[PDB]
Ligand binder design. Structure first.
Ligand SMILES: [Ca+2]
Ligand SMILES: [Cl-]
Ligand SMILES: [Cl-]
Ligand SMILES: [Cl-]
Ligand SMILES: [Cl-]
Ligand SMILES: [Cl-]
Ligand SMILES: [Cl-]
Ligand SMILES: [Cs+]
Ligand SMILES: [Cs+]
Ligand SMILES: [Cs+]
Ligand SMILES: [Cs+]
Ligand SMILES: [Cs+]
Ligand SMILES: [Cs+]
Ligand SMILES: [Cs+]
Ligand SMILES: [Cs+]
Ligand SMILES: [Cs+]
Ligand SMILES: [Cs+]
Ligand code: NA
Length: 274
């Protein structure tokens, strides 16, 4: 039968789905290692590959498939259940099968997503430095009305040190940190001024190649929860701007402690989408 990963009720995504809001006709671009499009529990409707040698609809890593499932694993009698199981899923391959990419591949993915009318961009990736063109791509995506989400990073804490990665660090992008099933910050989750919200990131079960289901840890698992939560809000309030969707997720989060470690806290999509 269908497992419901603990992150689904924890952000109260299940309460919004029961009101009948599932992210239908919201278009979500997963910028990642691609997506195993043939997986029985995912529907990939389009996409693009900026990675030499690999088509957008295959995933030799597993990472993009797993991130896609947390957004949009189908609601049926099998597998897992995504935060927004009715979204239009786009696989935008910007990371190779070894799990990494170039700044220009990522930049091209962002631009593809903005040019093609995506409503939400998820980036479960991060680097220490970013680039001038990455900044402009995220800025333009945001100013054009796309909700842009990225993993804060798995660099943990070390004293006063900001350890937030790029692109999460750009103020156009929502930086998502990671909690576990007890709503406590996972140790690997990056900290700093830019941290905006927490979502589930330790012990996250999702779709994984070939045709199976797997548990991973990372702020990468946290980000798609926030990307799916944005899609839920938009399916319920279709005329909100990106600023508005972002402000709702933010301002209604469950406070958990110091914003340095938790941002505004754990997203609550029931409160956000009301
Ligand atoms: Ca399913
Ligand atoms: Cl690797
Ligand atoms: Cl530490
Ligand atoms: Cl900044
Ligand atoms: Cl806590
Ligand atoms: Cl801030
Ligand atoms: Cl508006
Ligand atoms: Cs499929
Ligand atoms: Cs295509
Ligand atoms: Cs691999
Ligand atoms: Cs299952
Ligand atoms: Cs905006
Ligand atoms: Cs650390
Ligand atoms: Cs330090
Ligand atoms: Cs913060
Ligand atoms: Cs909108
Ligand atoms: Cs507070
Ligand atoms: Na940011």
């Amino acid at each position: 039968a269908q497992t419901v990963p603990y992150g689904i009720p924890l952000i109260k995504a299940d309460k919004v789905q029961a009101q009948g809001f599932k992210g239908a006709n919201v278009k979500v671009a997963v910028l990642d290692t691609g997506i195993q499009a043939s997986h029985p529990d995912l529907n990939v409707v389009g996409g693009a590959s900026f990675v030499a040698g690999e088509a957008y609809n295959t995933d030799g890593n597993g990472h993009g498939t797993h991130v896609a499932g947390t957004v949009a694993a189908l609601d049926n009698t099998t597998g897992v259940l995504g935060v927004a199981p009715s979204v239009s899923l786009y696989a935008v391959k910007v990371l190779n099968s070894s799990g990494s990419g170039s700044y220009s591949g990522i930049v091209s993915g962002i631009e593809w997503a903005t040019t093609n009318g995506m409503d939400v961009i998820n980036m479960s990736l991060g680097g220490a430095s970013g680039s001038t063109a990455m900044k402009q791509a995220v800025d333009n995506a945001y100013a054009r009305g796309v909700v842009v989400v990225a993993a804060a990073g798995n660099s943990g804490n070390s004293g006063s040190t900001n350890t937030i990665g790029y692109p999460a660090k750009y103020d156009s992008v929502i930086a998502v940190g990671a909690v576990d099933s007890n709503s406590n910050r996972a140790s690997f989750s990056s900290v700093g001024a830019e941290l905006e919200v927490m979502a589930p990131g330790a012990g996250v079960y999702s779709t994984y190649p070939t045709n199976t289901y797997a548990t991973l840890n990372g702020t990468s698992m946290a980000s798609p929860h926030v990307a799916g939560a944005a899609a839920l809000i938009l399916s319920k309030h279709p005329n909100l701007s990106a600023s508005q969707v972002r402000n709702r997720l933010s301002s209604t989060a469950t406070y958990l402690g110091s914003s340095f470690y938790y941002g505004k806290g754990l997203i609550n999509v029931e409160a956000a989408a009301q």
